[PDB]
Amino acid sequence: QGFSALEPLVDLPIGINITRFQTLLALHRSYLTPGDSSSGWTAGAAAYY
């Protein structure tokens, strides 16, 4: 809970009417099996909101 004290770091204008939003998990697993994000192939248990 704590508190929030958010501070600006990058404030550069772009000028695009954005409608979508997606993020890259950058997941990866063993090199032996090239899953290519088909099933599993994650080897990670993190989270985001």
Binding site: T23, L24, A26, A47
Partner: protein
Amino acid sequence: TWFHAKRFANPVLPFNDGVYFASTEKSNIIRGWIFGTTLDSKTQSLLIV
């Protein structure tokens, strides 16, 4: 919304006049924050990595 990274969690979300993000992680898993009006070659799409 909880978007844990165990399974595949990469849903495209509307940019509802602003957005918030947080992520608890004992790693550097999350790297990408791509944006765009349609995430296509036709329209300009912001890519953050």
